[PDB]
Amino acid sequence: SGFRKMAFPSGKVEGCMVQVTCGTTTLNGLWLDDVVYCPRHVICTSEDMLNPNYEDLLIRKSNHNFLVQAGNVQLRVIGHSMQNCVLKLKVDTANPKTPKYKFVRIQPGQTFSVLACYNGSPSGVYQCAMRPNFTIKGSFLNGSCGSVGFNIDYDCVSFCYMHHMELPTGVHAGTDLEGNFYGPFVDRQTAQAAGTDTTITVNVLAWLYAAVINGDRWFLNRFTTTLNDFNLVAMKYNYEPLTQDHVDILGPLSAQTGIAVLDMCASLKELLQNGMNGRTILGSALLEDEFTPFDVVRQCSGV
Amino acid sequence: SGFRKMAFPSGKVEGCMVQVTCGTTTLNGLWLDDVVYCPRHVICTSEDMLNPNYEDLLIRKSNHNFLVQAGNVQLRVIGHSMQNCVLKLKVDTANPKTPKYKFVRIQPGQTFSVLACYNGSPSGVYQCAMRPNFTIKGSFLNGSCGSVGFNIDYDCVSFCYMHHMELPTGVHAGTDLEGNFYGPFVDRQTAQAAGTDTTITVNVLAWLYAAVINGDRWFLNRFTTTLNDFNLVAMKYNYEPLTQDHVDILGPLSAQTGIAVLDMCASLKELLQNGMNGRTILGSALLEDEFTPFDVVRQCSGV
Ligand SMILES: *C(=O)[C@H](C[C@@H]1CCNC1=O)NC(=O)[C@H](CC#C)NC(=O)/C=C/c1ccccc1
Ligand SMILES: *C(=O)[C@H](C[C@@H]1CCNC1=O)NC(=O)[C@H](CC#C)NC(=O)/C=C/c1ccccc1
């Protein structure tokens, strides 16, 4: 028993992290087979950051402008190309530690683990959710770009995020591993701001089920609600609408606890309207929305 | 910027995890050089759990009673011995992936990363604090015993915890890697219960400093307090006394933010007496005490 924000074990990804330097800019790269992937803004200079033309900067570069170090073995760059907001640096050695992997783009509301790195060396690992507004609430300092987010399924790493920047609100923005940004952000210099965020309703419900599985029951009631009358309340509190598919996804947790999804919705409505009155759920005084139903089942299997 | 509960990268520890089976009991072991360490209750059976005599059970065992698997390469046990609540199984191969390591016992109030494992295979990684009552608030299911907690300093893994059991309150208890329990617990069957816990005051202060470093300032004031008048309030709210050494440890955070430790104490006193009135700090509606000053500096270096 117990419930914690749990990251995937990071070893398979640690073996892929390299350091990429171009000019006086050093950041992190991801070394899979004989390609290193990194953010294309590694080729920018201070004088072209408001709106660099990345195609010009790249045509003016050669292979020898890119210094790639794995630990401190130097990898020779033998080819370079741009794919959207990511650079692909072909190197003369295939990474012997290349895991089975996929490049997957995730959906708002899904979670993943982040391996924060600096200078090619892993610093720490933590769990993030892709917010409905396509930002993530992470922990990233100068030098962390090129750090990646991932899930593991069996022994296949599905990479889903590469870090590019921090917004003025302190949240973070990046791309998938094909270099396509999550959300309406660009790797330049704008006053760029995220769209208004909402709470991931299905995840809050999943987390209430985790709480029940862990003996927290004070918020339950006999009330049930209709999906319509629940979504009326959700809209008022800036929660995303709940769909029948969300109810279906919550099925196994429903069956494990014997609490119908719409009964748990009745509990959430009461929590939204009355708050907690000084009590906690799984150690939180806020309703937590960064656990998916899968995160709960994975951690709470058999109580 | 940003602040998250961050674990250490788990790769160096993943390479040490093995599966240890004796009888019908399978749990996790830690393979360093030519020794596998695991909880001694792996030799228990259902009929001797209230108070096993572990010296009898062990004398009645042979090397061939212990099946040790790394991945699925079988390691031959060539020697066995008991060290307090841990077994040391000598095996015929030194672990090629053995990192530089230390066996360190930590203090209440210090943090560490846990690599939760089942059947020798790492499941996830998360950060824990050793509570003042020598329990940890983790996430452990049946089969997780032998999972270890650790810190990393440079490239040396300091192992500090091996998991043995869950208490009735849902918290967890274990030993250091010499097999000496943290706290007044035993690896048998008792109605055993933890002593009353307290809040780690120096860590709450460190976390307030992290919040300031991340732009959360609403809880500050010009008030300052004396260390004595603060500890009077702390005692009332079940917080541990703050010492001059704690004030010294908080020095660098004090200097980085320009807020004197005793000024930050004045803020904490107000927070204890008035609560937050519906606001949050670093995304929490509770005062967080599982970040050490070191955790903050490590994550918040240079804003
Ligand atoms: C890459 O390492 C770095 C990561 C951020 C540094 C500070 N915290 C980060 O996550 N990426 C950048 O610095 C990019 C570079 C480009 C283009 N730029 C930004 O993050 C811009 C931030 C900003 C904030 C407020 C106003 C303007 C720009
Ligand atoms: C080892 O894998 C296991 C870990 C716990 C299982 C359930 N969650 C755990 O963290 N260790 C045990 O099961 C040990 C074995 C011994 C001795 N026993 C307990 O954890 C006893 C728990 C308990 C709770 C309430 C009343 C009595 C006993």
Coordinates of C-alpha atoms and ligand atoms in Angstrom, one line a residue, chain A residues 27 41 49 54 140-145 163-168 172 187-190, chain B residues 1, ligand 1:
Chain A
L27 CA 23.0 21.1 -24.2
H41 CA 18.4 26.1 -31.0
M49 CA 17.2 34.7 -30.9
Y54 CA 17.1 28.1 -38.7
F140 CA 14.4 22.7 -15.6
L141 CA 17.4 25.0 -15.3
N142 CA 19.7 26.6 -17.9
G143 CA 21.5 23.7 -19.7
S144 CA 18.6 21.2 -19.4
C145 CA 17.4 21.4 -23.0
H163 CA 12.7 19.9 -23.5
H164 CA 13.1 23.3 -25.3
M165 CA 12.1 26.2 -23.1
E166 CA 10.4 27.8 -20.0
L167 CA 7.5 30.2 -20.3
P168 CA 7.1 33.3 -18.2
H172 CA 7.8 24.3 -19.6
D187 CA 11.7 28.0 -30.3
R188 CA 12.5 31.6 -30.7
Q189 CA 12.0 34.8 -28.5
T190 CA 8.4 35.8 -28.0
Chain B
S1 CA 12.8 27.0 -12.5
Ligands
LIG1 C1 17.7 25.0 -22.6 O1 18.5 24.5 -21.9 C2 16.8 26.1 -22.0 C3 15.8 25.6 -20.9 C4 15.2 26.7 -20.0 C5 16.4 27.8 -19.3 C6 15.8 28.3 -18.3 N1 14.7 27.2 -17.8 C7 14.4 26.3 -19.1 O2 13.7 25.4 -19.1 N2 16.0 26.7 -23.1 C8 16.0 28.2 -23.3 O3 16.6 28.9 -22.6 C9 15.2 28.7 -24.5 C10 16.1 29.0 -25.7 C11 15.4 29.4 -26.9 C12 14.8 29.7 -27.9 N3 14.5 30.0 -24.3 C13 13.6 30.1 -23.1 O4 13.4 29.3 -22.4 C14 12.9 31.5 -23.0 C15 12.4 31.7 -21.8 C16 11.7 33.1 -21.7 C17 11.0 33.5 -20.6 C18 10.4 34.7 -20.5 C19 10.6 35.6 -21.5 C20 11.3 35.3 -22.7 C21 11.9 34.0 -22.8

